[PDB]
Amino acid sequence: DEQQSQAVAPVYVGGFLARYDQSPDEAELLLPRDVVEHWLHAVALPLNINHDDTAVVGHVAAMQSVRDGLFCLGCVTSPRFLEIVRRASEKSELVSRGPVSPLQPDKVVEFLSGSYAGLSLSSTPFKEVALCSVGRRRGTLAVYGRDPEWVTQRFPDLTAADRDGLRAQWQRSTAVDGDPFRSDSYGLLGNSVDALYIRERLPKLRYDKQLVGVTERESYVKA
Amino acid sequence: QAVAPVYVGGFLARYDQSPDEAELLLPRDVVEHWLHAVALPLNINHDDTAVVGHVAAMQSVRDGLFCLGCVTSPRFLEIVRRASEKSELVSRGPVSPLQPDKVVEFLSGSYAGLSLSSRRTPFKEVALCSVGRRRGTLAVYGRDPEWVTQRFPDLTAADRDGLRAQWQGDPFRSDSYGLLGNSVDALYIRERLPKLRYDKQLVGVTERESYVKA
Protein backbone atom coordinates (compact mmCIF):
# COMPACT_ATOMS: atom_id res chain seq x y z
CA ASP A 1 0.00 0.00 0.00
CA GLU A 2 2.66 2.48 1.09
CA GLN A 3 5.06 1.07 -1.49
CA GLN A 4 2.15 0.60 -3.90
CA SER A 5 1.31 4.26 -3.27
CA GLN A 6 4.60 5.36 -4.79
CA ALA A 7 3.98 3.14 -7.80
CA VAL A 8 0.94 5.22 -8.75
CA ALA A 9 2.57 8.61 -8.16
CA PRO A 10 2.66 10.75 -11.34
CA VAL A 11 4.88 9.67 -14.22
CA TYR A 12 6.59 12.11 -16.54
CA VAL A 13 7.38 11.28 -20.14
CA GLY A 14 9.63 13.15 -22.53
CA GLY A 15 10.88 12.81 -26.06
CA PHE A 16 10.89 14.22 -29.55
CA LEU A 17 7.59 14.28 -31.41
CA ALA A 18 9.52 15.02 -34.58
CA ARG A 19 13.15 15.22 -35.68
CA TYR A 20 13.91 17.92 -38.25
CA ASP A 21 16.87 15.87 -39.50
CA GLN A 22 14.64 12.91 -40.39
CA SER A 23 13.12 12.76 -43.88
CA PRO A 24 10.07 10.43 -43.96
CA ASP A 25 8.96 8.47 -47.05
CA GLU A 26 5.34 9.40 -46.32
CA ALA A 27 4.37 13.02 -46.94
CA GLU A 28 1.75 12.83 -44.18
CA LEU A 29 4.51 12.67 -41.55
CA LEU A 30 6.27 15.85 -42.70
CA LEU A 31 6.58 18.45 -39.95
CA PRO A 32 9.16 21.18 -40.76
CA ARG A 33 10.60 23.55 -38.18
CA ASP A 34 8.83 26.57 -39.68
CA VAL A 35 5.47 24.80 -39.44
CA VAL A 36 6.05 23.80 -35.81
CA GLU A 37 7.22 27.29 -34.77
CA HIS A 38 4.28 29.03 -36.43
CA TRP A 39 1.64 27.12 -34.45
CA LEU A 40 3.88 26.78 -31.40
CA HIS A 41 5.71 30.09 -30.92
CA ALA A 42 4.40 33.50 -32.00
CA VAL A 43 -3.76 25.34 -23.47
CA ALA A 44 -2.55 21.99 -22.11
CA LEU A 45 -3.01 19.24 -24.71
CA PRO A 46 -4.30 15.90 -23.43
CA LEU A 47 -2.05 12.85 -23.37
CA ASN A 48 -3.63 9.54 -24.39
CA ILE A 49 -2.96 5.96 -25.46
CA ASN A 50 -2.60 5.57 -29.22
CA HIS A 51 -4.84 8.58 -29.91
CA ASP A 52 -7.89 7.07 -28.23
CA ASP A 53 -10.29 9.67 -26.79
CA THR A 54 -11.33 7.19 -24.12
CA ALA A 55 -7.76 6.56 -23.00
CA VAL A 56 -6.62 9.99 -21.79
CA VAL A 57 -4.00 9.40 -19.09
CA GLY A 58 -2.69 12.90 -18.48
CA HIS A 59 -1.51 16.09 -20.15
CA VAL A 60 1.39 17.70 -21.98
CA ALA A 61 3.35 19.95 -19.61
CA ALA A 62 5.81 21.46 -22.06
CA MET A 63 6.43 21.70 -25.79
CA GLN A 64 9.62 23.18 -27.25
CA SER A 65 11.01 23.56 -30.74
CA VAL A 66 14.76 23.04 -30.55
CA ARG A 67 17.71 22.64 -32.89
CA ASP A 68 17.06 18.96 -33.64
CA GLY A 69 13.27 18.79 -33.54
CA LEU A 70 10.10 19.23 -31.51
CA PHE A 71 10.52 18.11 -27.91
CA CYS A 72 7.69 17.23 -25.58
CA LEU A 73 7.28 16.59 -21.84
CA GLY A 74 4.08 14.98 -20.63
CA CYS A 75 2.67 13.96 -17.28
CA VAL A 76 0.74 10.71 -16.72
CA THR A 77 -1.71 11.42 -13.88
CA SER A 78 -4.74 9.08 -14.20
CA PRO A 79 -5.15 7.06 -10.99
CA ARG A 80 -7.12 4.39 -12.87
CA PHE A 81 -4.54 4.05 -15.63
CA LEU A 82 -1.61 3.91 -13.19
CA GLU A 83 -3.29 1.27 -10.98
CA ILE A 84 -4.01 -0.87 -14.06
CA VAL A 85 -0.35 -0.50 -15.03
CA ARG A 86 0.74 -1.32 -11.47
CA ARG A 87 -1.17 -4.63 -11.46
CA ALA A 88 0.09 -5.74 -14.87
CA SER A 89 3.67 -4.78 -13.96
CA GLU A 90 3.54 -7.32 -11.12
CA LYS A 91 2.98 -10.09 -13.66
CA SER A 92 5.72 -9.11 -16.09
CA GLU A 93 8.96 -11.11 -16.22
CA LEU A 94 10.46 -8.22 -18.19
CA VAL A 95 9.74 -5.94 -15.25
CA SER A 96 10.87 -8.58 -12.70
CA ARG A 97 14.30 -8.53 -14.40
CA GLY A 98 14.55 -4.85 -13.45
CA PRO A 99 16.44 -1.81 -14.80
CA VAL A 100 20.16 -1.32 -15.41
CA SER A 101 22.08 -1.48 -12.13
CA PRO A 102 22.20 2.00 -10.55
CA LEU A 103 18.55 2.78 -11.29
CA GLN A 104 16.02 1.98 -8.60
CA PRO A 105 13.48 -0.61 -9.69
CA ASP A 106 10.24 1.14 -10.59
CA LYS A 107 7.71 -1.39 -11.84
CA VAL A 108 5.19 1.17 -13.12
CA VAL A 109 7.84 3.20 -14.97
CA GLU A 110 9.41 0.03 -16.36
CA PHE A 111 6.09 -1.31 -17.62
CA LEU A 112 5.31 1.99 -19.35
CA SER A 113 8.82 2.07 -20.81
CA GLY A 114 8.38 -1.41 -22.22
CA SER A 115 4.83 -1.07 -23.59
CA TYR A 116 4.48 2.51 -24.82
CA ALA A 117 8.01 3.19 -26.06
CA GLY A 118 7.05 5.71 -28.71
CA LEU A 119 5.57 9.21 -28.88
CA SER A 120 3.05 10.21 -31.55
CA LEU A 121 1.85 13.63 -32.65
CA SER A 122 -1.31 13.75 -34.77
CA SER A 123 -4.34 15.89 -35.64
CA THR A 124 -6.17 23.33 -34.27
CA PRO A 125 -3.10 21.51 -35.66
CA PHE A 126 -1.71 20.44 -32.28
CA LYS A 127 -4.67 18.34 -31.12
CA GLU A 128 -3.08 15.95 -28.63
CA VAL A 129 -0.08 13.72 -27.92
CA ALA A 130 -0.26 9.94 -27.82
CA LEU A 131 1.80 7.24 -26.14
CA CYS A 132 2.14 4.33 -28.57
CA SER A 133 4.17 1.12 -28.83
CA VAL A 134 6.42 2.69 -31.48
CA GLY A 135 6.18 5.97 -33.40
CA ARG A 136 5.75 6.31 -37.16
CA ARG A 137 8.16 9.26 -37.14
CA ARG A 138 11.74 8.22 -36.32
CA GLY A 139 13.43 9.51 -33.16
CA THR A 140 10.17 9.55 -31.21
CA LEU A 141 11.42 7.36 -28.35
CA ALA A 142 9.44 7.82 -25.15
CA VAL A 143 11.45 8.31 -21.97
CA TYR A 144 9.74 7.79 -18.61
CA GLY A 145 10.81 8.97 -15.16
CA ARG A 146 9.48 10.27 -11.83
CA ASP A 147 11.26 13.63 -12.13
CA PRO A 148 10.80 16.12 -15.04
CA GLU A 149 14.36 17.42 -14.72
CA TRP A 150 15.71 13.86 -14.79
CA VAL A 151 13.76 12.95 -17.93
CA THR A 152 15.03 16.01 -19.82
CA GLN A 153 18.58 15.15 -18.76
CA ARG A 154 18.25 11.84 -20.66
CA PHE A 155 18.64 13.69 -23.98
CA PRO A 156 22.20 14.84 -24.82
CA ASP A 157 20.93 17.16 -27.58
CA LEU A 158 19.18 19.45 -25.12
CA THR A 159 21.33 22.36 -23.89
CA ALA A 160 20.97 24.02 -20.48
CA ALA A 161 19.08 26.81 -22.22
CA ASP A 162 16.71 24.33 -23.86
CA ARG A 163 16.03 22.76 -20.47
CA ASP A 164 15.44 26.19 -18.93
CA GLY A 165 12.69 26.90 -21.44
CA LEU A 166 11.07 23.53 -20.81
CA ARG A 167 11.28 24.00 -17.04
CA ALA A 168 9.57 27.38 -17.12
CA GLN A 169 6.77 25.48 -18.84
CA TRP A 170 6.21 22.47 -16.60
CA GLN A 171 6.51 24.61 -13.48
CA ARG A 172 3.35 26.37 -14.67
CA SER A 173 -3.52 23.16 -12.81
CA THR A 174 -4.78 21.67 -16.08
CA ALA A 175 -8.32 21.34 -17.43
CA VAL A 176 -7.77 17.80 -18.71
CA ASP A 177 -7.09 16.65 -15.15
CA GLY A 178 -10.78 14.18 -11.82
CA ASP A 179 -9.57 11.09 -13.67
CA PRO A 180 -9.77 11.71 -17.44
CA PHE A 181 -9.36 7.99 -18.22
CA ARG A 182 -12.42 6.29 -19.73
CA SER A 183 -11.08 2.87 -20.72
CA ASP A 184 -9.94 -0.24 -18.84
CA SER A 185 -7.44 -3.08 -18.62
CA TYR A 186 -9.41 -4.96 -21.29
CA GLY A 187 -8.91 -1.98 -23.56
CA LEU A 188 -5.17 -1.90 -22.96
CA LEU A 189 -5.02 -5.69 -23.40
CA GLY A 190 -6.76 -5.42 -26.77
CA ASN A 191 -4.15 -2.89 -27.85
CA SER A 192 -1.21 -5.05 -26.67
CA VAL A 193 -1.83 -7.68 -29.37
CA ASP A 194 -1.84 -4.99 -32.08
CA ALA A 195 1.66 -4.04 -30.96
CA LEU A 196 2.87 -7.61 -31.44
CA TYR A 197 2.43 -7.26 -35.19
CA ILE A 198 4.06 -3.90 -35.82
CA ARG A 199 6.94 -4.67 -38.17
CA GLU A 200 10.51 -3.60 -37.36
CA ARG A 201 9.23 -2.51 -33.94
CA LEU A 202 12.48 -3.24 -32.09
CA PRO A 203 14.81 -2.07 -34.89
CA LYS A 204 12.84 1.18 -35.11
CA LEU A 205 13.03 1.62 -31.33
CA ARG A 206 16.76 0.83 -31.27
CA TYR A 207 17.31 3.27 -34.14
CA ASP A 208 15.37 5.95 -32.25
CA LYS A 209 17.39 5.35 -29.08
CA GLN A 210 20.71 5.89 -30.88
CA LEU A 211 19.42 8.92 -32.81
CA VAL A 212 18.45 10.82 -29.65
CA GLY A 213 21.45 9.66 -27.64
CA VAL A 214 19.46 8.07 -24.82
CA THR A 215 21.91 5.20 -25.28
CA GLU A 216 24.57 7.51 -23.83
CA ARG A 217 22.91 7.75 -20.41
CA GLU A 218 21.03 5.32 -18.17
CA SER A 219 17.26 5.21 -18.32
CA TYR A 220 14.34 2.80 -18.02
CA VAL A 221 14.09 2.23 -21.78
CA LYS A 222 13.66 -1.51 -22.40
CA ALA A 223 14.56 -1.50 -26.10
CA GLN B 1 -21.18 -17.83 -28.85
CA ALA B 2 -17.90 -15.92 -28.78
CA VAL B 3 -17.30 -17.46 -25.35
CA ALA B 4 -18.01 -20.99 -26.60
CA PRO B 5 -15.10 -23.47 -26.57
CA VAL B 6 -12.05 -22.84 -28.73
CA TYR B 7 -9.85 -25.67 -30.00
CA VAL B 8 -6.14 -25.22 -30.64
CA GLY B 9 -3.90 -27.61 -32.50
CA GLY B 10 -0.29 -27.89 -33.53
CA PHE B 11 2.95 -29.76 -33.05
CA LEU B 12 4.54 -29.60 -29.62
CA ALA B 13 7.74 -30.80 -31.30
CA ARG B 14 9.13 -31.55 -34.75
CA TYR B 15 11.39 -34.62 -34.83
CA ASP B 16 13.12 -33.16 -37.90
CA GLN B 17 14.08 -29.94 -36.10
CA SER B 18 17.40 -29.78 -34.27
CA PRO B 19 16.87 -27.97 -30.93
CA ASP B 20 19.63 -25.38 -30.63
CA GLU B 21 19.26 -26.24 -26.93
CA ALA B 22 20.24 -29.58 -25.40
CA GLU B 23 17.33 -29.31 -22.96
CA LEU B 24 14.70 -28.94 -25.69
CA LEU B 25 15.61 -32.21 -27.42
CA LEU B 26 12.67 -34.59 -27.70
CA PRO B 27 13.22 -37.89 -29.60
CA ARG B 28 10.34 -39.84 -31.13
CA ASP B 29 10.90 -42.98 -29.05
CA VAL B 30 10.84 -41.21 -25.67
CA VAL B 31 7.61 -39.56 -26.82
CA GLU B 32 5.88 -42.70 -28.06
CA HIS B 33 6.77 -44.44 -24.80
CA TRP B 34 4.94 -41.94 -22.59
CA LEU B 35 2.20 -41.81 -25.21
CA HIS B 36 -0.36 -44.46 -26.21
CA ALA B 37 2.01 -45.39 -29.05
CA VAL B 38 -5.97 -37.06 -15.91
CA ALA B 39 -6.02 -34.82 -19.00
CA LEU B 40 -3.05 -32.44 -19.09
CA PRO B 41 -3.95 -28.86 -18.17
CA LEU B 42 -3.80 -26.16 -20.84
CA ASN B 43 -2.54 -22.83 -19.50
CA ILE B 44 -1.08 -19.49 -20.47
CA ASN B 45 2.70 -19.27 -20.66
CA HIS B 46 3.10 -22.04 -18.07
CA ASP B 47 1.45 -20.01 -15.28
CA ASP B 48 -0.51 -22.50 -13.17
CA THR B 49 -2.86 -19.75 -11.99
CA ALA B 50 -3.76 -19.36 -15.68
CA VAL B 51 -5.23 -22.74 -16.63
CA VAL B 52 -7.65 -22.12 -19.50
CA GLY B 53 -8.58 -25.69 -20.41
CA HIS B 54 -7.18 -29.13 -21.18
CA VAL B 55 -5.38 -31.17 -23.81
CA ALA B 56 -8.08 -33.09 -25.69
CA ALA B 57 -5.73 -35.27 -27.77
CA MET B 58 -2.10 -36.10 -28.52
CA GLN B 59 -0.74 -38.13 -31.44
CA SER B 60 2.78 -39.10 -32.42
CA VAL B 61 2.94 -38.77 -36.19
CA ARG B 62 5.61 -38.96 -38.89
CA ASP B 63 6.87 -35.40 -38.38
CA GLY B 64 6.47 -35.05 -34.63
CA LEU B 65 4.11 -34.80 -31.70
CA PHE B 66 0.76 -33.29 -32.63
CA CYS B 67 -1.55 -31.92 -29.95
CA LEU B 68 -5.12 -30.69 -29.84
CA GLY B 69 -6.23 -28.52 -26.93
CA CYS B 70 -9.58 -27.11 -25.83
CA VAL B 71 -9.95 -23.67 -24.23
CA THR B 72 -13.04 -23.85 -22.03
CA SER B 73 -12.56 -21.48 -19.09
CA PRO B 74 -15.48 -18.99 -19.10
CA ARG B 75 -13.55 -16.42 -17.04
CA PHE B 76 -10.68 -16.53 -19.55
CA LEU B 77 -12.96 -16.53 -22.62
CA GLU B 78 -14.90 -13.50 -21.33
CA ILE B 79 -11.66 -11.62 -20.62
CA VAL B 80 -10.52 -12.39 -24.15
CA ARG B 81 -13.88 -11.35 -25.59
CA ARG B 82 -13.67 -7.85 -24.07
CA ALA B 83 -10.07 -7.30 -25.09
CA SER B 84 -10.84 -8.50 -28.64
CA GLU B 85 -13.38 -5.68 -29.05
CA LYS B 86 -10.60 -3.16 -28.47
CA SER B 87 -8.09 -4.66 -30.91
CA GLU B 88 -7.50 -3.02 -34.27
CA LEU B 89 -5.78 -6.16 -35.53
CA VAL B 90 -8.93 -8.13 -34.70
CA SER B 91 -11.18 -5.47 -36.21
CA ARG B 92 -9.43 -5.97 -39.56
CA GLY B 93 -10.76 -9.54 -39.67
CA PRO B 94 -9.40 -12.73 -41.35
CA VAL B 95 -8.62 -13.44 -45.02
CA SER B 96 -11.49 -13.30 -47.54
CA PRO B 97 -13.45 -16.57 -47.16
CA LEU B 98 -13.03 -17.07 -43.39
CA GLN B 99 -15.73 -15.44 -41.29
CA PRO B 100 -14.71 -13.09 -38.45
CA ASP B 101 -14.34 -14.59 -34.99
CA LYS B 102 -12.97 -12.00 -32.58
CA VAL B 103 -12.11 -14.32 -29.67
CA VAL B 104 -10.44 -16.81 -32.01
CA GLU B 105 -8.56 -14.03 -33.77
CA PHE B 106 -7.32 -12.46 -30.51
CA LEU B 107 -6.06 -15.86 -29.39
CA SER B 108 -4.40 -16.52 -32.78
CA GLY B 109 -2.60 -13.20 -32.53
CA SER B 110 -1.64 -13.25 -28.86
CA TYR B 111 -0.67 -16.88 -28.29
CA ALA B 112 0.68 -17.96 -31.64
CA GLY B 113 2.80 -20.75 -30.16
CA LEU B 114 2.54 -23.98 -28.18
CA SER B 115 4.90 -25.17 -25.45
CA LEU B 116 5.32 -28.55 -23.76
CA SER B 117 7.28 -28.56 -20.51
CA SER B 118 7.42 -32.28 -19.69
CA ARG B 119 10.48 -31.07 -17.79
CA ARG B 120 11.21 -33.37 -14.84
CA THR B 121 7.15 -36.97 -14.35
CA PRO B 122 6.41 -37.28 -18.11
CA PHE B 123 4.15 -34.78 -19.89
CA LYS B 124 3.25 -32.07 -17.39
CA GLU B 125 1.26 -29.40 -19.18
CA VAL B 126 0.91 -27.59 -22.49
CA ALA B 127 1.14 -23.83 -22.57
CA LEU B 128 -0.24 -21.38 -25.09
CA CYS B 129 2.52 -18.78 -25.52
CA SER B 130 3.36 -15.86 -27.83
CA VAL B 131 5.93 -18.12 -29.57
CA GLY B 132 7.39 -21.51 -28.69
CA ARG B 133 11.04 -22.26 -27.93
CA ARG B 134 10.94 -25.33 -30.20
CA ARG B 135 10.43 -24.59 -33.90
CA GLY B 136 7.32 -25.76 -35.73
CA THR B 137 5.10 -25.21 -32.69
CA LEU B 138 2.66 -22.81 -34.35
CA ALA B 139 -0.74 -22.74 -32.63
CA VAL B 140 -3.84 -22.94 -34.86
CA TYR B 141 -7.17 -21.92 -33.33
CA GLY B 142 -10.68 -22.79 -34.47
CA ARG B 143 -14.20 -23.65 -33.29
CA ASP B 144 -14.29 -27.08 -34.96
CA PRO B 145 -11.58 -29.60 -33.97
CA GLU B 146 -11.92 -31.27 -37.39
CA TRP B 147 -11.22 -28.04 -39.24
CA VAL B 148 -8.21 -27.30 -37.03
CA THR B 149 -6.63 -30.67 -37.79
CA GLN B 150 -7.31 -30.21 -41.52
CA ARG B 151 -5.06 -27.11 -41.33
CA PHE B 152 -1.90 -29.22 -41.21
CA PRO B 153 -1.07 -30.88 -44.59
CA ASP B 154 1.34 -33.29 -42.88
CA LEU B 155 -1.45 -35.12 -41.06
CA THR B 156 -3.01 -38.18 -42.69
CA ALA B 157 -6.57 -39.50 -42.43
CA ALA B 158 -5.15 -42.23 -40.22
CA ASP B 159 -3.47 -39.58 -38.07
CA ARG B 160 -6.77 -37.70 -37.81
CA ASP B 161 -8.81 -40.75 -36.85
CA GLY B 162 -6.45 -41.37 -33.95
CA LEU B 163 -6.85 -37.78 -32.78
CA ARG B 164 -10.58 -37.79 -33.47
CA ALA B 165 -11.07 -40.79 -31.18
CA GLN B 166 -9.41 -38.81 -28.42
CA TRP B 167 -11.15 -35.43 -28.57
CA GLN B 168 -14.41 -37.23 -29.33
CA GLY B 169 -15.50 -25.27 -11.73
CA ASP B 170 -13.57 -22.65 -13.69
CA PRO B 171 -9.83 -23.47 -13.43
CA PHE B 172 -8.59 -20.02 -14.47
CA ARG B 173 -7.26 -18.11 -11.44
CA SER B 174 -5.82 -15.08 -13.22
CA ASP B 175 -7.07 -11.78 -14.71
CA SER B 176 -6.84 -9.21 -17.49
CA TYR B 177 -3.95 -7.60 -15.59
CA GLY B 178 -1.92 -10.80 -15.63
CA LEU B 179 -2.40 -11.29 -19.35
CA LEU B 180 -1.44 -7.65 -19.90
CA GLY B 181 1.81 -8.05 -17.97
CA ASN B 182 2.59 -11.14 -20.07
CA SER B 183 1.80 -9.09 -23.18
CA VAL B 184 4.67 -6.65 -22.62
CA ASP B 185 7.06 -9.54 -22.15
CA ALA B 186 6.08 -10.89 -25.55
CA LEU B 187 7.17 -7.61 -27.15
CA TYR B 188 10.76 -8.33 -26.18
CA ILE B 189 11.04 -11.98 -27.23
CA ARG B 190 13.70 -11.76 -29.92
CA GLU B 191 12.92 -12.74 -33.50
CA ARG B 192 9.35 -13.52 -32.47
CA LEU B 193 7.83 -12.93 -35.90
CA PRO B 194 10.69 -14.49 -37.89
CA LYS B 195 10.40 -17.64 -35.77
CA LEU B 196 6.61 -17.72 -36.10
CA ARG B 197 6.83 -17.30 -39.88
CA TYR B 198 9.44 -20.06 -39.93
CA ASP B 199 7.14 -22.37 -37.97
CA LYS B 200 4.24 -21.45 -40.25
CA GLN B 201 6.24 -22.40 -43.34
CA LEU B 202 7.46 -25.61 -41.68
CA VAL B 203 3.99 -26.98 -40.90
CA GLY B 204 2.41 -25.74 -44.14
CA VAL B 205 -0.26 -23.51 -42.60
CA THR B 206 -1.31 -20.31 -44.40
CA GLU B 207 -3.00 -17.10 -43.23
CA ARG B 208 -4.97 -17.48 -46.46
CA GLU B 209 -6.83 -20.46 -44.95
CA SER B 210 -6.60 -20.02 -41.18
CA TYR B 211 -6.80 -17.29 -38.54
CA VAL B 212 -3.02 -17.26 -38.06
CA LYS B 213 -1.75 -13.68 -37.86
CA ALA B 214 2.01 -14.07 -38.31
From Swiss-Prot, chain A:
UniProt-annotated location(s): Host nucleus
Organism domain of life: Viruses
Active site: 51 (charge relay system), 120 (charge relay system), 128 (charge relay system)
Recorded coiled-coil stretches: none
Record's catalysed reaction(s): Cleaves -Ala-|-Ser- and -Ala-|-Ala- bonds in the scaffold protein
Subunit record text: Exists in a monomer-dimer equilibrium with the dimer being the active species.
Described function: Protease that plays an essential role in virion assembly within the nucleus. Catalyzes the cleavage of the assembly protein after formation of the spherical procapsid. By that cleavage, the capsid matures and gains its icosahedral shape. The cleavage sites seem to include -Ala-Ser-, -Ala-Ala-, as well as Ala-Thr bonds. Assemblin and cleavages products are evicted from the capsid before or during DNA packaging.
Name assigned to this protein: Assemblin
Organism of provenance: Human cytomegalovirus (strain AD169)
